[PDB]
Amino acid sequence: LDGDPDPGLPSTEDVILKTEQVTKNIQELLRAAQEFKHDSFVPCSEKIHLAVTEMASLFPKRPALEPVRSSLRLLNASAYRLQSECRKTVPPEPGAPVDFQLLTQQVIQCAYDIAKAAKQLVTITTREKKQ
């Protein structure tokens, strides 16, 4: 803990590496989709959540940024949706009941959303001065 909300970020570098790593984790989910790797979706989605939680963890329990407050909602929700979506994959036979075709669309939408959501977070830190 500390007290009042923070205007900017604690560590500039930590943020960059935290965001840069997020984009990479997402690529794993996308690449696995095009290569039809439902079994790789479980881990690919998990690794992505780590970057999301790890990044948010660096932030205080009470942010002082307008976009930071909302960004935490979409960011956290992004990793949550991907986990729940990937959680129900089609590792079994190809004739399974699950809609494998729809699965790829779900992971792509979530991955693309979380990936783009990071752009707004990385740009906010760079543009920010905290002086």
UniProtKB/Swiss-Prot annotation:
Phosphorylated on tyrosine residues by PTK2/FAK1 and SRC in growing fibroblasts. It is required for the interaction with NCK2 and for GIT1 recruitment to synapses in hippocampal neurons. Widely expressed. Expressed at high levels in testis (at protein level). Expressed in the brain, including in CA1 hippocampal neurons, in the amygdala, and thalamic nuclei (at protein level). Residues 7-131 are annotated as: Interaction with PXN and TGFB1I1. It is found in: Cytoplasm; Synapse; Presynapse; Postsynapse. Forms homodimers and possibly oligomers. May form heterooligomers with GIT2. Interacts with G protein-coupled receptor kinases, including GRK2, GRK3, GRK5 and GRK6. Interacts with PPFIA1, PPFIA2 and PPFIA4. Interacts with GRIP1 and forms a ternary complex with PPFIA1 and GRIP1. Directly interacts with ARHGEF7/beta-PIX, forming in vitro a heptameric complex made of a GIT1 dimer and an ARHGEF7 trimer. Directly interacts with PXN/paxillin; this interaction is enhanced in the presence of ARHGEF7. Directly interacts (via C-terminus) with TGFB1I1/Hic-5 (via LD motif 3). The coiled coil region mediates dimerization. GTPase-activating protein for ADP ribosylation factor family members, including ARF1. Multidomain scaffold protein that interacts with numerous proteins and therefore participates in many cellular functions, including receptor internalization, focal adhesion remodeling, and signaling by both G protein-coupled receptors and tyrosine kinase receptors. Through PAK1 activation, positively regulates microtubule nucleation during interphase. Plays a role in the regulation of cytokinesis; for this function, may act in a pathway also involving ENTR1 and PTPN13. This is ARF GTPase-activating protein GIT1. It comes from Rattus norvegicus. The chain holds residues 640 to 770 of 770 of the full protein.
